[PDB]
C-alpha cells in the first residue's frame, strides 16, 4: 500500500477477485468431457449449463441446472477440457 505492482499481482490475490474486477476479465467457468457408465461417447458439457443436457446415445440425464454450477448426475466420468 502506497506502492505495489498492479500489473503483476499474485495469482492468489487475483483468483479470489470477481471475474470482472481482475486486471483483464475472463470467465471462471469451464467445459467438461462427460461419459455416463452406459455408453463410451464423450459429451461436451458447460459447467453453468442452464439445460438438462442429455446423452444423445442413451437419452438419460447428465446434469441438472442450479443457480451456478450444474449438478452432475450420479457417478459418471467427467474431465475439465
Partner RNA sequence: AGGGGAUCGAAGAUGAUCAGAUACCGUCGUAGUCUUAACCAUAAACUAUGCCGACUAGGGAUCGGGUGGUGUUUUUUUAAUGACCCACUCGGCACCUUACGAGAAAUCAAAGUCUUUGGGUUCUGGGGGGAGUAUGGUCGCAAGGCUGAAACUUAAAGGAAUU
Partner RNA sequence: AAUCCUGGAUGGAACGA
Counting every residue, how long is the chain? 81
Q: Which is nearer to RNA, 56 or 81 (CB)?
A: 81
Cell of 21: 474486477
Residues 72 and 12: their CA atoms lie apart, in Å, by 28
4 binds another protein (CB under 8 A): yes
9 binds another protein (CB under 8 A): yes
Closest approach, Cβ 30 to RNA, in A, equals 10
Q: Which residue's C-alpha cell is 459429451?
A: 43
Interacting residues with another protein (CB under 8 A): 1-10, 13, 23-25
Amino acid at each position: 500500500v502506497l506502492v505495489q505492482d498492479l500489473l503483476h499481482p499474485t495469482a492468489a490475490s487475483e483468483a479470489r477477485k470477481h471475474k470482472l474486477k481482475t486486471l483483464v476479465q475472463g470467465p471462471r467457468s469451464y467445459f467438461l468431457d462427460v461419459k455416463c457408465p452406459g455408453c463410451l461417447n464423450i459429451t461436451t458439457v458447460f459447467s453453468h449449463a442452464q439445460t438438462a443436457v442429455t446423452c444423445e446415445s442413451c437419452s438419460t440425464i447428465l446434469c441438472t441446472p442450479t443457480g451456478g454450477k450444474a449438478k452432475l448426475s450420479e457417478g459418471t466420468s467427467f474431465r475439465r477440457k
